[PDB]
């Protein structure tokens, strides 16, 4: 499992989407009480 930073919102490099190892761009952030999903 690679050592990845935490995602922000449509990223430059590979990062954790909530707790999911996800490629740059595809980490999506839904509103309210919904957790960040890897697309």
Swiss-Prot record:
Keyword Secreted applies: yes
Protein family according to the UniProt entry: Belongs to the ornatin family.
Protein name: Decorsin
GO biological process: cell adhesion
MF terms (GO), sorted A to Z: enzyme inhibitor activity
Keywords of this entry: Cell adhesion, Secreted
Superkingdom of origin: Eukaryota
Species of the source: Macrobdella decora (North American leech)
Cellular localisation: Secreted
């Amino acid at each position: 499992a690679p050592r990845l930073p935490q995602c922000q919102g449509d990223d430059q490099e590979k990062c954790l989407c909530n707790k999911d190892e996800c490629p740059p761009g595809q980490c999506r952030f839904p509103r309210g009480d919904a957790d960040p999903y890897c697309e």
